Subunit: 306 residues, 6 copies
Amino acid sequence: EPEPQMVLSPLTSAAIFLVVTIDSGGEDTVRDLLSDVASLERAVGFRAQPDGRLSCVTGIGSEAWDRLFSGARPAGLHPFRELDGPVHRAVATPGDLLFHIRASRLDLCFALATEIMGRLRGAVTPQDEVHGFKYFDERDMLGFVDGTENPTGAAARRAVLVGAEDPAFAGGSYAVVQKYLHDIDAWEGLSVEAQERVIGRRKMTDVELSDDVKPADSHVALTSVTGPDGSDLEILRDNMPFGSVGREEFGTYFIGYARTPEVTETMLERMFLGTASAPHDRILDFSTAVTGSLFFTPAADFLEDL
Amino acid sequence: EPEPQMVLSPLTSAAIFLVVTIDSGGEDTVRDLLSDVASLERAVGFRAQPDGRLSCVTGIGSEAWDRLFSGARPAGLHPFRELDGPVHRAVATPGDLLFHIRASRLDLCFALATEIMGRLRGAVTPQDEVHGFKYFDERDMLGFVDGTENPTGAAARRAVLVGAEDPAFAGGSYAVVQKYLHDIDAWEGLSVEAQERVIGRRKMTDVELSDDVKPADSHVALTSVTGPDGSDLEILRDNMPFGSVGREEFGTYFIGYARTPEVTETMLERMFLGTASAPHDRILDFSTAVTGSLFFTPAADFLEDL
Amino acid sequence: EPEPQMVLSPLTSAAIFLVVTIDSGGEDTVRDLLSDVASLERAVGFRAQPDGRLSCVTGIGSEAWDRLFSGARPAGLHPFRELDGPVHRAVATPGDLLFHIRASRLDLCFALATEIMGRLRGAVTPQDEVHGFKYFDERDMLGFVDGTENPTGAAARRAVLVGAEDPAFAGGSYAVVQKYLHDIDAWEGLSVEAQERVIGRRKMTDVELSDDVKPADSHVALTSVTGPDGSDLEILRDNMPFGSVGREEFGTYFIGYARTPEVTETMLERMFLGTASAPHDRILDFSTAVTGSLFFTPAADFLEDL
Amino acid sequence: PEPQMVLSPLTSAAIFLVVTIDSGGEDTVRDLLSDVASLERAVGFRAQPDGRLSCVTGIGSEAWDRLFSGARPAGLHPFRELDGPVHRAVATPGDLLFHIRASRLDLCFALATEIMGRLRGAVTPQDEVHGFKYFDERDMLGFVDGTENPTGAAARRAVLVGAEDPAFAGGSYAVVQKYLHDIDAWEGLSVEAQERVIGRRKMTDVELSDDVKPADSHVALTSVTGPDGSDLEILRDNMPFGSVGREEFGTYFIGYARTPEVTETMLERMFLGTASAPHDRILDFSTAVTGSLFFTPAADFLEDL
Amino acid sequence: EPEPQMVLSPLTSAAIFLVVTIDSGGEDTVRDLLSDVASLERAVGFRAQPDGRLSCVTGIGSEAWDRLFSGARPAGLHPFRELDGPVHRAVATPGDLLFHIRASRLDLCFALATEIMGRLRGAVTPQDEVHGFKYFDERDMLGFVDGTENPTGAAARRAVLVGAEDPAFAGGSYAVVQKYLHDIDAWEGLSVEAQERVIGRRKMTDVELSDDVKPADSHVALTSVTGPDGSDLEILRDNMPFGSVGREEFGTYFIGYARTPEVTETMLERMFLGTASAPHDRILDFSTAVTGSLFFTPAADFLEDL
Amino acid sequence: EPEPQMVLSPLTSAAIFLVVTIDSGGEDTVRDLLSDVASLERAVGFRAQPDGRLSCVTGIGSEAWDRLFSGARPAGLHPFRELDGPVHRAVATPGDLLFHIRASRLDLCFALATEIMGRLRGAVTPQDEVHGFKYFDERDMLGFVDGTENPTGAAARRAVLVGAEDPAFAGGSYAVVQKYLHDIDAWEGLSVEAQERVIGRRKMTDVELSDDVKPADSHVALTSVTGPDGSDLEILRDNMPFGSVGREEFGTYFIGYARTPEVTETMLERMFLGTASAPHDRILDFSTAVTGSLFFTPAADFLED
Ligand code: HEM
Ligand code: HEM
Ligand code: HEM
Ligand code: HEM
Ligand SMILES: [Mg+2]
Ligand SMILES: [Mg+2]
Ligand SMILES: [O]
Ligand SMILES: [O]
Ligand SMILES: [O]
Ligand SMILES: [O]
Ligand SMILES: [O]
Ligand SMILES: [O]
């Protein structure tokens, strides 16, 4: 069976997200680093075992893939698609490589990010760096519990990992990232009951609103999608708050993994373009996307052997 | 005793340092916030007891003191004094208020910073915001253990808290802050033995170099000061690493507390201006100060009663 | 393919056992709740991950099964069989649903019980509610370590989960519950050596008595059974102390899971009715059963699909 | 004089045990009082330092006069019933209180077992509640409970008898009330309406500002200043308890103070109201079913019996 | 106040006891080490804060004192006194320096012992080295909880620290050490009830036997001493199991601290020589002392100032 | 289907290594103990769950195998082979049984060792007993992080457990032990950069030296082996510091598990006898082997019958 990267991580309370572009002439430096990234993860993480829980998931974009590798492409790999909705826009922003670094402490994240970027100096240009922290009750910046309905165990493996449908790339996954900034002043002007109608769950107790009260333009309603067979199509999310109080930046860094980007893209279309029953996802009236990128995260074997 | 602020905190692995200036006309809003800052610390922190260990130490600058308060001044309060050394310079930068927020996790720090700045919107201008994290074995960004010779218990209390020498302000302290950025490329070009000669301690085991090998221009040699009495003059430090990998910013946020600023200032003069046997502290050949401010941190009761 | 409930839970230090009967006309309300119980476990539990270790195992009795479902019954499902021994009696008491709620803290158990019962009030009548706690170093109220010879890993899965012998119900299990009250005054009148002879293991060190000295009417001797094939027949137990000091109630809540009730029932026959060499299990001279019920705990997907 | 462990660290489990002393049980009770600290160490030591087991023992007014002779604590009297226009604070029997706290219920239970084992035949149980911390220091109404308790020296000064009653210095006065909540009614309010009842924000536990906090909120009525301008404070360690099958959801209130006058003033304001408030709105969702007052002596008083 | 050494340590589960004699000419090397031992404790321990709980208490014997220092002697310092009882003997063995090193883990103790002995190589001869480990429920090698009636807080300070009675040495203490080996086969041949009679407390529950049933020759009876003043005379103990299974060595390392050796010496006389009602402490019928030494542990400032 | 011993343990910070020989006539006592050793592991360890992490791996040597059992032998079981290198020597020393006892605390290790040896008194002679302790940041006595490149998960199972190649013994493993003593004075005389050249990794950050700067006689270079197919051959190690400051003994107790001893033996030959590019492993210039033994650790089911 092929060994995936640590897409299915334990719960972690710190993350660094690093998105870079590859400069002209930097391909070979990048390739050497890809073949060492797992050993750097162990070097930095081992001595903090077992509670460190350091992992790094490395992703490669569509245009970058063609620069770095020849042969087969993953079937679902394409550039992030801009969505120009009637009201809200999901922008596409440049990104060749993603490093999704997670641990139980920010310092381990930082130490590994330092080693990675030290090897890439002069070959890449940083496009985004976010230092994320979880709130202590798994809450996000809007004050709701964030992650509750993620799949677990076998159902998670089936939702996130490429299998026999693209056998050369089995054990990989597709990651979509978007950095969101929130209008907290507007959000805090809503009553709790109104906020619950935006999200689709109760705020304090995290119980889902019943089908007869949950609005069609709530976040939970629009991101619930069923496949041909009547079964739910699922993604795995690990959204992280971030911010700066002096600049009034209060953010959610969205990351979602799926076996095929189509699932994630369907959810995004429903959110931003709307449906017959819903103009758009009401969460977007308090949340603005400022980045958007899609990456393929190969199996760990693929990175080692190259 | 009067009740001090939580200057002598347990070890905490996260901090936010927030420095602001008070805008014209902002004084009343600031005074209201000062009288409520202890209750905001409890509101954010109590529910995370006992692990959260959230505390906020609030400091007031010399010029701000004059704008905010009627009567007598703490004896040692003055603006930070610039040191113009033959090679290195300690700059003075603006700062009216300091919020030194510490906890076992960054989210609690952020939540308290958000509430404080929410109340001060419109009355203050942010000057500096640093999100600090401790490395896992109390190391700083230069790879050395940082904190080892801090005083503890009664010796700490005696070194840090104003007493009978200034009885109206008993239970306060004086905080000096400087944000330092490091030249990591240069530092990593030294051998370990050369780095040990700069600091004055062994890198891996943190054992002090013996008196016959410790250079006169090492950091430990220059920041060891004896008073008239033959006794050691001590400060309490809680230096925090910070940075950004993409911008190549690797930093130490220095903060030192003492019962009189003279102790801290003597150490700084020795570092920047040197002595008979040392041109300057060798740590400054790898460290540039980009801020410098001095604050008085009053007793908790002083702030409550406004 | 089939996902069991969390029968094989990590060690947890708190539990709630809830046994109810279904009132006339309550079947529809019960069926709606069964399809949502996994959702409620996530809503309460997710925000306390990963330490909370909250789970709910839901079991259905023989008579209730026929009221709720039509089509196939699990092969082994029948009402608990009363054992009328010459001295000791194992009573059968009413029970249609079992909720076996476990966590590392009681509040999570209570919160989930509250949500379940909130949905069912008006449809069910409570018959028993016990709040269990871990007592020292995995000890029970008799002062002996309790759980030592439980199977683990693969052997646990094979002992507890229905497989190919009843393929429509694969991934389920059978739970037997009995609430026992102890005569502590009588028990504490025995010497430690005499107590060890009752149980069959050493009290302080939990070392099993050798074959030469272990009495045939000890608890360990009577609950050790080999099948026709020479191999040990095993169950999985998660007995919990409970009590009330003012009422002088000191109890053990017995729960045992097995892939077929015949294993558990054989152990019970040996305990209450005896063998050629042993009149009854000596533990029963200090322990009285006041409830007795048998439940089938279906695979998690069986409940989801209602 | 060494106080009992009235000022405990935060603990997540408690047992509250209230008993009456049967006719003729006085001598058995006195022997147990002189050993209770030894039993606390015997049960607790092996779980140190995380166990944080402690037992505070209190004695009621009528019981005091049966057990001891000579001078009595200045403020010791039976709990005073409050018969308000709407709400009533009842007085219920109780001679001895054992307030047992730890980081785990088993330690509490083990110590309660040893204490009651020694008292068998001399006392009759009146109340037994097994309390648990609920999430992030929340109570059964879903609000953080404990936030404005005093700490450190301010706590010592609010709770321990001193020079005002020198023979009993180092003691304290405990008031207990068991409350049951009408959760269905409470959950019918919006969050904003619940915040108006309590006087703080629900999710963030920030106090409402003085211009929106109602005069009949819980925080408004239990804030009291003395003649000299300073806050009169008590130390509380309220614990949730309940039973899901009986629909019983409760708060076990316990408040310590250096004189019962402080606690009693707060209770009068809650139950009988003020010029601007008919009663504490929390009582529209909360019914007291017990009420007792105890003196908790200095530890050396108990040792020397 | 003077600063005492860490005689009153938190509970620690590992220890190293080192006893050495000072060779001919070794005094200067020893004096240098004594003035640095507090800084070695910080160097090894600080980076393992807060869990490490590393400390070192350094003690000096009667003969050694006169070689190392001139001026005043502590009033109670003398060589350990052999007690030649009718049956049992408390032996005296050589020792000039004691290092009592404690932590939550053996490796930290070892690291500090390595640095100390590294500095003393060539100046001292090792006499004893014991690596001690506590059992997980504070039990000793005999299976009883060990530590229960130690004083705590103010009562401990008053029992252990020299004060105004010898003001030049205020903040010091006196340590007695004895290494005991046990006859485990004999001990394990007793019933639990018989063992309880030897100790004076219940084995499982650690409740003291009542005055009416506790034998006069039990350990607890003989080590309970009242002074002329009516009050209990107390010491602070931190006994540690040690051993080697291959050599059949199972031991208790006794260490007891007191403000004057007379308290400890009185207890030893009662144990070894007996009383009117007791021939000797019954624990000695299962325990043989093979070392015996007495040390003065000075205040920390005394050592720093050399 | 066959249940291995706890060869793949979580990280543990304490260990006891116990090596014994079986005396003449002691075979029956040993066989009885082997059938009970897993139940002793549970008796001592269950009550210390979940933090205790106590396990015992039991190994049997080649000559002992023939005394205890007849029928099939594991295919790879033979006595440890002495290596007489031009400079350094790997000695073979006697040992019939190995008990590799691990936990989060030394007391649990000792408690289990006591029970095991209690049952074997009179039947065995101890040859070695080592009480190991890991440093807090997974460092060894040389100050380097130790364990970093061990395999994990499925790669560990595939490297360590006997499978279809020897189906009667599937689920077993082969353990090689060597006790090393270090010359710490010589080691501490090297600069950090020189130490890094001996090991092959950076000391502070544990990052491997790049291929173009890593010396051919570094420890990491010589213990990296590829098989016929070009894939890496791996072992699982759990090296433990030990020592005595008074006797100036500072040691590493090496234990390596592998599905066949050939892998471990190839690494040893490279270390002691060298290659075309390297006279020997530079770590041996600071480390002397004073024991050497090889054991088969059967599947747990094999011992239970
Ligand atoms: C500002 C950005 C976002 C915030 C603050 C946010 C927050 C939340 C919250 C609070 C929940 C409910 C609890 C749970 O995690 O199950 C949730 C659910 C969900 N969100 Fe988001 N979300 C964001 C963006 C997105 C995006 C961009 C997508 C998809 C492309 C997405 C997909 C989901 C899905 C699939 C669920 C689960 C729904 C279900 O099956 O119940 N989220 N989100
Ligand atoms: C770039 C900024 C700095 C870095 C990275 C740094 C780092 C260190 C390190 C590694 C030590 C040795 C371990 C310890 O005792 O903490 C130390 C000690 C010390 N530093 Fe700094 N330091 C900085 C700035 C300062 C400044 C600006 C002051 C004074 C104004 C200062 C005062 C001290 C003192 C008093 C000590 C302890 C000396 C003693 O052993 O008695 N440091 N520092
Ligand atoms: C008063 C109620 C009970 C108490 C206090 C109790 C207590 C114990 C104790 C102390 C042990 C020894 C350690 C271990 O758990 O392995 C044990 C073992 C066991 N008990 Fe119970 N038990 C009770 C009722 C029952 C019942 C009703 C059954 C089965 C119907 C049962 C089945 C077992 C089994 C199978 C074992 C393990 C035997 C073996 O060593 O293989 N127990 N029990
Ligand atoms: C003499 C004492 C020994 C010490 C102190 C020691 C120490 C180390 C250290 C520090 C490392 C690097 C970090 C790691 O991956 O664990 C290492 C790696 C390793 N050691 Fe040892 N070692 C010793 C003996 C041995 C022996 C005897 C063998 C084999 C027969 C061996 C096999 C290995 C292997 C295979 C690696 C992994 C190399 C790789 O692929 O990176 N070691 N050892
Ligand atoms: Mg009903
Ligand atoms: Mg109701
Ligand atoms: O999400
Ligand atoms: O510093
Ligand atoms: O059991
Ligand atoms: O309260
Ligand atoms: O002792
Ligand atoms: O190794």
